[PDB]
Amino acid sequence: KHSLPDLPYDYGALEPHINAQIMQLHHSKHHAAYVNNLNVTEEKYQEALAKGDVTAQIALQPALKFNGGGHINHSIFWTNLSPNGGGEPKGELLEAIKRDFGSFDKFKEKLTAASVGVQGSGWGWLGFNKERGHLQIAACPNQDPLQGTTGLIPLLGIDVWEHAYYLQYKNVRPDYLKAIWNVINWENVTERYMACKK
Amino acid sequence: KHSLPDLPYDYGALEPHINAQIMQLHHSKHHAAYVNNLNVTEEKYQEALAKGDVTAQIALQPALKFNGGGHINHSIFWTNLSPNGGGEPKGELLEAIKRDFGSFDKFKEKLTAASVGVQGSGWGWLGFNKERGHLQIAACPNQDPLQGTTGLIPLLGIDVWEHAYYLQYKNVRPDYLKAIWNVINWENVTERYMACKK
Amino acid sequence: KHSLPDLPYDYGALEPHINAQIMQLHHSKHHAAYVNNLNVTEEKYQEALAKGDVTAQIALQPALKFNGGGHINHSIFWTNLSPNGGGEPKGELLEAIKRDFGSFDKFKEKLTAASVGVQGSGWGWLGFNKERGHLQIAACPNQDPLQGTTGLIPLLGIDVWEHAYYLQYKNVRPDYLKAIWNVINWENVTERYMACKK
Amino acid sequence: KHSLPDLPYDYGALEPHINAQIMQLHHSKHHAAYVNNLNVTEEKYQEALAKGDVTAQIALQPALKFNGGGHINHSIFWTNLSPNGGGEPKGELLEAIKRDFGSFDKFKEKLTAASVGVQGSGWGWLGFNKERGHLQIAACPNQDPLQGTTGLIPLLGIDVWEHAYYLQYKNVRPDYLKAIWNVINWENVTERYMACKK
Ligand SMILES: [Mn+2]
Ligand SMILES: [Mn+2]
Ligand SMILES: [Mn+2]
Ligand SMILES: [Mn+2]
């Protein structure tokens, strides 16, 4: 079975950057949608695998990636956010940011960059490229997962799907994206960071 | 130059199905975004064509389709909607619907079908397949145009991009999709229809 | 376990249309490659499913579709070919061809059409669209299966991957495509046809 | 007008690695195909741009990228190959290879890696990522150009489209890929390299 994470703060705790109406729905109506369909599909995909049924296995695949990836994209997100989060990453992570984007503000535009240009629905990502032992920004389509689709390890991800900001910023994706920095829980983005080791 | 169509009714005129806050923004902040970037890109793409510069031509391509298709997808949409629109297509169009989906409610389910399943951002489409002289439902990704990407002729399209319903239906795409029928200006969907001739 | 079909004729039996060097390799070196990797992957995909491991499940997906689809695309192919095959489809199938493409020669160009324009590697397909009870030509990318990716039922498929003709027609895909008609086992393309029933 | 480059050696000059039957056809029948269709399409695309005809512009797009990118992918290729080419990149380029893949054999494996895994038709690429001032291996689909589609600068590319090796290595892509090293004209791959400057 797969289950919906409780988010590490109330809905309320990310005001004013992200309002609680958006957190209310992102977690409960949105993320829960994916977990449940992940479950129905994975269910169906251990049945069809078992029969060796390669066309219904291939047919259950976009379903599996949308909800699969939609479950794990949004599960990393809540953790990347926190009220006593925010500011700039201390220590090691910061230094890697410095070593790879030149400076934290250069790193910040480079990620607003990726995120603000997702044509349609998708995500912006600060990832880790462990074959090259460095940071790496990537943007992903729909709920297409960073590691499931590129092999890069997710440290920080930004949802730019309209359901993530619209009820608040309306058409202005980059306003959302500016608010977002203030709740970025660098203490966890670092934990993910450290996990990766050279 | 490309210019933003005025929509054929005030924002207000599609209440309660689509509220005027949504119409206000879809036309003004959203569609206008695409026209203007269409223009900057087409500008740049007659410069680079002129230099025979095939890599910057290929680079301006997703930009051109997003805003190109985003301009023409949304320009057909306003025309497919009207207050004294709605109900059931009379005459010829209805009959083709009957001949191709069996009945208008079978046709309606088949198009909610397409639309409600757009993984991510995209559109549901009642099109015309002129190589086979019949109707044809198609769903398109992002602002990927029906005829620019499939050759099918657009008669009726439904935006299922979240920016089309979210401020009102929130996570409930199919509620939007049920409201939508009541403003469907069949008189124009028919005009597009007739244009196609066998 | 998945196993390689024996092909229903010797390599030799499709001369001169397709030479036996090509049949030798298509079946033995090519198709067998896919079956074996289908097996290793499906193996790995019942392990990771079992652990509920959604990122390695999503990572095994292009592997599964390439070899999955590559196994079932090529398994339908051999059956669509035969020496005492060829000519035009008798009875019902022919009539559906007449009803959907106007005539067998109109149907033949419409399928050379699809096949000859596969940008890169892929397949041309005479399929069945069972939601609309009619024939339907479709072209698929790489070893992307007709029914696994579109829901259409495969009656006749043409490989236009270069490995299918190159050792013989070299750069001339459409020469291959003309030869191909002469070995088209219409007796089986019909059996697939009939299976579909309205 | 666009014109076919003469290749910098006779067909013959890359034996035994790539045979002259393959060079004969790659340059003459294959690359020439793309130049000519580039030309017809670019022609049509300055007509339709001129009329502001956004759906026929979007329709001429896959045509333009296939032949556009197919023209420029194959034009860089001939230059990356030479008889008095081969071996090990001297100086600066070598050092960047050392700095980015650890060693030239690690770099070689990493690029056979990319190339040998192109599902279907495509290319493996040693590129330059000028926003990060370093080397970067990328693999591209069909004739999808490195810089036109990723912004990375092409220094060395390997065609793994079957038309590049099949008449010689048949199903064995990696044999082709091993032969390939021996004709790699490092003197030019370096010139492209140096052009990029930090
Ligand atoms: Mn989301
Ligand atoms: Mn819209
Ligand atoms: Mn094949
Ligand atoms: Mn080539």
Please report the DSSP string for B151-167 in residue order. Answer: -PEEEEEEE-SGGGTHH
In a domain, B13, yes or no: no
If you ran DSSP here, which 8-state letter would residue B34 be given?
A: H
How far is the C-alpha of D10 from the C-alpha of D20, rounded, in Å? Answer: 8
Mode of pairing for the β-strands spanning D134-141 and B122-129: unpaired
In a domain, D3, yes or no: no
In a domain, A47, yes or no: yes
Within chain A, how many helices (H) and strands (E) appear?
A: 10, 3
Cα–Cα nearest to B120, from C89, A194, A70: A70
The answer to whether residues B143 and B73 touch, using CB atoms and an 8 Å cutoff, is yes
Measured in Å, residue A75 CA sits from the centre of ligand 1 at: 10
Neighbours, chain C (3 or more CB pairs < 8 A): A, B, D
Verify whether the Cβ–Cβ distance C141 to D120 is below 8 Å: yes
Cα–Cα nearest to C137, from C121, C117, C119, C157: C157
Half-sphere exposure of C123 (CA within 13 A, CB side): 25
Query: How many Å lie between the alpha carbon of A137 and the closest alpha carbon of chain D?
Result: 11
Verify whether the Cβ–Cβ distance D59 to B2 is below 8 Å: no
CB pairs under 8 A between C and D: 55
Measured in Å, residue D128 CA sits from the centre of ligand 3 at: 34
Scanning every residue of chain D, which has its alpha carbon at the shortest distance from the alpha carbon of C21?
D170
The answer to whether residues D41 and D63 touch, using CB atoms and an 8 Å cutoff, is yes
Neighbours, chain A (3 or more CB pairs < 8 A): B, C, D
Question: In this complex, which of A66, A143, A171 lies closest to B25 when CB atoms are compared?
Answer: A171
Place of tokens 């890069």: A152
Cα–Cα nearest to D156, from D194, D190, D105: D190
> Do residues C88 and C149 both lie within one domain?
yes
In a domain, C72, yes or no: yes
Neighbours, chain D (3 or more CB pairs < 8 A): A, B, C
The answer to whether residues C79 and C41 touch, using CB atoms and an 8 Å cutoff, is no
CATH of the domain at A69: 1.10.287.990
How far is the C-alpha of D22 from the C-alpha of D8, rounded, in Å? Answer: 15
Does C89 contact chain A (CB < 8 Å)?
no
Look at chain C and count its residues. Answer: 198
Question: Per the annotation, does C26 bind a ligand?
Answer: yes
Which of residues A82, A108, A129 is at a domain's end? A82
The answer to whether residues C104 and C98 touch, using CB atoms and an 8 Å cutoff, is yes
For residue D113, report the phi and psi dihedrals to the nearest 5 degrees.
-50, -65
Domain boundaries, position B185? 83-198
In B26-48, which positions are buried (b, 16+ CB within 10 angstroms) versus exposed (e)? bbeebbbebbebbbebbebbeeb
How far is the C-alpha of B33 from the C-alpha of D134, rounded, in Å? Answer: 35
Tokens matching residue A120:
């349609």
**Residues of chain C positioned with their CB less than 8 A from the CB of A49:** 42, 45-46, 49
> Do residues A113 and A135 both lie within one domain?
yes
> Do residues A96 and A52 both lie within one domain?
no
> Do residues D94 and D136 both lie within one domain?
yes
Question: Per the annotation, does B26 bind a ligand?
Answer: yes
> Do residues B65 and B111 both lie within one domain?
no
Q: Please name every residue paired with C123 in a beta bridge, in sequence order, or none if there are none.
A: C140, C159
Does D120 contact chain C (CB < 8 Å)?
yes
In a domain, B183, yes or no: yes
Cα–Cα nearest to A62, from C35, C128, B117, C152: B117
Q: What is the largest CA-CA distance in chain C?
A: 54
Which of residues B40, B64, B82 is at a domain's end? B82
The H-assigned helical ranges of chain B are 20-25, 32-50, 54-59, 61-80, 91-101, 104-116, 146-150, 166-169, 173-180, 186-195
> Do residues C145 and C196 both lie within one domain?
yes
CATH of the domain at A115: 3.55.40.20
* SS3 of residue C136 by DSSP: strand
In a domain, C129, yes or no: yes
C-alpha dihedral sign at C128, C129, C135, C136:
negative
> Do residues D123 and D186 both lie within one domain?
yes
> Do residues D130 and D166 both lie within one domain?
yes
The answer to whether residues B5 and A151 touch, using CB atoms and an 8 Å cutoff, is no
Half-sphere exposure of A137 (CA within 13 A, CB side): 22
Give kind and range of the element (H or E) at residue A187.
helix A186-195
Does B29 contact chain A (CB < 8 Å)?
yes
Q: How far is residue C8 CA from its own chain's centroid?
A: 15
Q: Please name every residue paired with B52 in a beta bridge, in sequence order, or none if there are none.
A: none
Does D100 contact chain A (CB < 8 Å)?
yes
> Do residues C98 and C174 both lie within one domain?
yes
* SS3 of residue B51 by DSSP: coil
Judged on CB neighbours under 10 Å (0-12, 13-18, 19+), A50 is exposed
Which of residues C39, C57, C82 is at a domain's end? C82
Q: Please name every residue paired with D125 in a beta bridge, in sequence order, or none if there are none.
A: D138, D157
Question: In this complex, which of C56, C57, C65 lies closest to A58 when CB atoms are compared?
Answer: C65
Scanning every residue of chain B, which has its alpha carbon at the shortest distance from the alpha carbon of D66?
B58
Tokens matching residue C44:
């790995």
> Do residues A198 and A142 both lie within one domain?
yes
Cα distance between the two ends of chain B: 34
Chain C, 130 to 159: residues with Cβ < 8 Å from chain A are 145, 147-149, 151
In a domain, A105, yes or no: yes
The number of beta carbons lying within 10 Å of the beta carbon of residue C103 is: 11
Half-sphere exposure of C20 (CA within 13 A, CB side): 7
**Residues of chain C positioned with their CB less than 8 A from the CB of D170:** 25, 29, 167
Mutate to test the interface with A, among C35, C54, C76, C146 (most CBs of A within 10 A): C54
Query: Reported resolution in A?
Result: 3.2
In a domain, A58, yes or no: yes
User: What is the domain count for chain D?
Assistant: 2
> Do residues A76 and A91 both lie within one domain?
no
> Do residues A148 and A77 both lie within one domain?
no
How far is the C-alpha of D145 from the C-alpha of D139, rounded, in Å? Answer: 10
Q: What was the experiment behind these coordinates? A: X-ray
Cα–Cα nearest to B159, from B93, B37, B39, B69: B69
Mode of pairing for the β-strands spanning B122-129 and C134-141: unpaired
